[PDB]
Amino acid sequence: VASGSGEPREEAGALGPAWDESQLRSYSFPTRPIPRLSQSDPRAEELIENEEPVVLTDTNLVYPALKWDLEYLQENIGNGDFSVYSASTHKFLYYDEKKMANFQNFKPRSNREEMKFHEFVEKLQDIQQRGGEERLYLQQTLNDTVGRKIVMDFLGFNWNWINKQQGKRGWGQLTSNLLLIGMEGNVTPAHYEEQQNFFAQIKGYKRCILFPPDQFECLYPYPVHHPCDRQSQVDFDNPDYERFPNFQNVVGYETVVGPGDVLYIPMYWWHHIESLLNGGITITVNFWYKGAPTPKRIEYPLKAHQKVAIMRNIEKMLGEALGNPQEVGPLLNTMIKGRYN
Amino acid sequence: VASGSGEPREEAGALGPAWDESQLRSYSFPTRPIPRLSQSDPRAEELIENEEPVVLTDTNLVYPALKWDLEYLQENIGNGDFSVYSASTHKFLYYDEKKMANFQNFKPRSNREEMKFHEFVEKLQDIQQRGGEERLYLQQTLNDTVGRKIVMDFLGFNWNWINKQQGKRGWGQLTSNLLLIGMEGNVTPAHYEEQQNFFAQIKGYKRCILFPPDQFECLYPYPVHHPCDRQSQVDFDNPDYERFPNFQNVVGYETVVGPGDVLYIPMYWWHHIESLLNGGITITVNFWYKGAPTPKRIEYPLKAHQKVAIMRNIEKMLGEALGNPQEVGPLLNTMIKGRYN
Numbered sequence: 085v086a087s088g089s090g091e092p093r094e095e096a097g098a099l100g101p102a103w104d105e106s107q108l109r110s111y112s113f114p115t116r117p118i119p120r121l122s123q124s125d126p127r128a129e130e131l132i133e134n135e136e137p138v139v140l141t142d143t144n145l146v147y148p149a150l151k152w153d154l155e156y157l158q159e160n161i162g163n164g165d166f167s168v169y170s171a172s173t174h175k176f177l178y179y180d181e182k183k184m185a186n187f188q189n190f191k192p193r194s195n196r197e198e199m200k201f202h203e204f205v206e207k208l209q210d211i212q213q214r215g216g217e218e219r220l221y222l223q224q225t226l227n228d229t230v231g232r233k234i235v236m237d238f239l240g241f242n243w244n245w246i247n248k249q250q251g252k253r254g255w256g257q258l259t260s261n262l263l264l265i266g267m268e269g270n271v272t273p274a275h276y277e278e279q280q281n282f283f284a285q286i287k288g289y290k291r292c293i294l295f296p297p298d299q300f301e302c303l304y305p306y307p308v309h310h311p312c313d314r315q316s317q318v319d320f321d322n323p324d325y326e327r328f329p330n331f332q333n334v335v336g337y338e339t340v341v342g343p344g345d346v347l348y349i350p351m352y353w354w355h356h357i358e359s360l361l362n363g364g365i366t367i368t369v370n371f372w373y374k375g376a377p378t379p380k381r382i383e384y385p386l387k388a389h390q391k392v393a394i395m396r397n398i399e400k401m402l403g404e405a406l407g408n409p410q411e412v413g414p415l416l417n418t419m420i421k422g423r424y425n
Numbered sequence: 426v427a428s429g430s431g432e433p434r435e436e437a438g439a440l441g442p443a444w445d446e447s448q449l450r451s452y453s454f455p456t457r458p459i460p461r462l463s464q465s466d467p468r469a470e471e472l473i474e475n476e477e478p479v480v481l482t483d484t485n486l487v488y489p490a491l492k493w494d495l496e497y498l499q500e501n502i503g504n505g506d507f508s509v510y511s512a513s514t515h516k517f518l519y520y521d522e523k524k525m526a527n528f529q530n531f532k533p534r535s536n537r538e539e540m541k542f543h544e545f546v547e548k549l550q551d552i553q554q555r556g557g558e559e560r561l562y563l564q565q566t567l568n569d570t571v572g573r574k575i576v577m578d579f580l581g582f583n584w585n586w587i588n589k590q591q592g593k594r595g596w597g598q599l600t601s602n603l604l605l606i607g608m609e610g611n612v613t614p615a616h617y618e619e620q621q622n623f624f625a626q627i628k629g630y631k632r633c634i635l636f637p638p639d640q641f642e643c644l645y646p647y648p649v650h651h652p653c654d655r656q657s658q659v660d661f662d663n664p665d666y667e668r669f670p671n672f673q674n675v676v677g678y679e680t681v682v683g684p685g686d687v688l689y690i691p692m693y694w695w696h697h698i699e700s701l702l703n704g705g706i707t708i709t710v711n712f713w714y715k716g717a718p719t720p721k722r723i724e725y726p727l728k729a730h731q732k733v734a735i736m737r738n739i740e741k742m743l744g745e746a747l748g749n750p751q752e753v754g755p756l757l758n759t760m761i762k763g764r765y766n
């Protein structure tokens with residue numbers, strides 16, 4: 085019942101288990117499995133409607149990308165610039181560069197380096213070459229500049245299905261598709277997005293651990309003006325229970341996606357994403373959508389994500405009102421101590 | 426230098442000290458004296474301009490009320506209804522009755538009872554009669570219904586001086602004059618107002634201890650939706666240093682006003698007001714003014730009162746946004762724990 089990702093799935097044509105338990109990292113918290121359903125299954129329609137996660141096994145959302153691999157992409161993706169993140173550890177914490185202004189005591193552990201696709205493949209094979217410890221992760225919005233055959237591939241994605249989805253949910257506009265290419269063992273640590281996300285797995289296997297928005301108290305996001313806004317301050321590998329005591333109460337929904345799977349990551353749901361160990365490279369394309377307009381007007385009791393949105397807006401205005409994001413905390417403290425605690 | 430109210434002043438015509446140290450209650454914190462200046466003294470103009478307190482000794486602000494006493498008032502104040510607050514202790518904590526809706530676990534220790542002036546005088550003499558322990562405090566906005574001679578008295582107040590004051594400071598409109606009649610030993614505990622206040626002493630002697638707005642952290646106001654909004658949660662007689670540790674750092678400005686004195690209580694300044702022990706009844710009329718409009722637009726660094734105004738508005742909106750004032754604290758806590766503390 086704290087199964088996790090369940091027994092590993094058996095590949096078609098007796099090809100043996102897709103992955104195994106020892107490819108998964110181990111954590112301090114328990115998990116229940118996210119359900120894997122067919123896109124035609126009413127229950128999957130329920131889950132998305134109710135903004136609960138679900139793994140859709142047969143959407144064909146990115147059917148033409150399933151052939152993609154580094155050789156094909158290097159060949160066909162064009163000469164555009166690609167954002168590539170570097171790291172010394174397996175954890176790729178991300179930094180909003182616009183926000184680094186107002187936090188000096190903040191040095192990166194993951195630098196963005198712009199480079200052509202072939203320089204990526206090259207760097208990858210230079211590192212592989214000599215068993216170097218360092219790691220990379222390419223993450224780049226698909227756009228205009230992309231080669232003829234990638235565009236045909238892109239156009240062949242299942243727009244009919246995902247557009248119906250956008251329509252049934254009242255979502256706003258598709259904002260971006262991010263292309264993610266990772267090395268085995270890479271972790272994008274726990275964070276949340278404000279958009280809705282269909283996360284479409286193309287190559288390799290990723291374990292995705294999700295936490296609902298009502299676990300805000302257990303996951304301790306950075307301050308909103310901090311560059312790691314929306315990310316957990318907790319190190320999943322070495323959790324500091326003195327600073328983050330509610331982490332001991334955290335409960336995840338967990339799954340492993342492979343080629344053809346689409347994971348619905350609902351708005352404000354925390355997610356932690358790791359490419360399996362010794363699984364090779366992973367490739368994923370996501371689909372971010374705005375999110376249905378806010379209701380006219382509120383109906384109580386508020387949803388967890390609505391309380392989160394409120395906390396964000398309080399922090400923001402207080403940043404503005406005080407003239408300085410650094411004064412947000414002392415003010416809030418002064419507001420609560422001996423008054424509301 | 427922590428003098429306090431200074432050596433007591435000597436009455437004209439060798440009538441001996443107006444009051445003495447043993448009429449003053451004793452507290453845990455130190456105080457410096459508020460300056461007593463002449464209204465013609467440029468330094469007093471400085472203090473009011475800079476929103477610092479000052480005791481003006483010669484305004485004649487309420488010259489015609491100096492003859493007032495219970496017999497005169499009973500005689501001349503008319504048959505209107507007068508708000509009279511009751512108490513079993515010397516501390517008259519006030520309750521906003523509009524706010525009692527959203528706090529059930531809140532019972533009074535000071536009930537408002539409407540009564541004619543003669544019923545007040547009567548009750549007072551019924552209690553005096555038999556050495557009863559209970560205490561009363563009349564506090565009633567002067568208005569329309571008031572007798573012919575009180576109106577002539579009122580009209581004889583020094584409008585020329587106080588209106589010039591209103592003009593020089595850019596204050597808005599006079600909102601009310603409250604008439605306060607107290608028994609010896611009555612304490613109105615520490616609180617702040619959002620209006621500017623010229624506090625005009627008429628009969629008897631009051632000790633006024635003021636704290637500037639930047640002592641918010643030491644004085645622990647109730648939540649804004651609580652009925653004791655703007656009042657300190659700290660009991661000055663028995664301070665709980667476990668709950669209110671910054672009370673140990675509190676520093677007051679202190680003075681004793683008698684007949685003819687006017688104390689400028691600047692906006693957002695905390696004040697604690699006690700009628701001297703065994704001093705007899707006290708009488709005071711205050712003059713509340715709105716407060717200059719807010720500046721277009723903000724200039725940094727913000728003043729303490731501006732940060733207070735912000736904390737108030739955060740608490741208010743969060744009350745509205747959450748649908749329920751009771752959920753304000755859990756939200757704020759969730760916002761700060763492990764995040765900003």
Ligand SMILES: O=C(O)CCC(=O)C(=O)O
Nearest residue numbers: 264272281283357368370
């Ligand atoms: O695949 C990853 O590591 C990041 C995915 C993610 O965070 C997202 O799609 O929102």
Ligand SMILES: O=C(O)CCC(=O)C(=O)O
Nearest residue numbers: 605613622624698709711
């Ligand atoms: O005289 C009192 O006890 C109350 C005075 C006061 O709080 C005020 O005038 O604002």
Ligand SMILES: [Zn+2]
Nearest residue numbers: 275276277355
């Ligand atoms: Zn994400």
Ligand SMILES: [Zn+2]
Nearest residue numbers: 616617618696
């Ligand atoms: Zn007051």
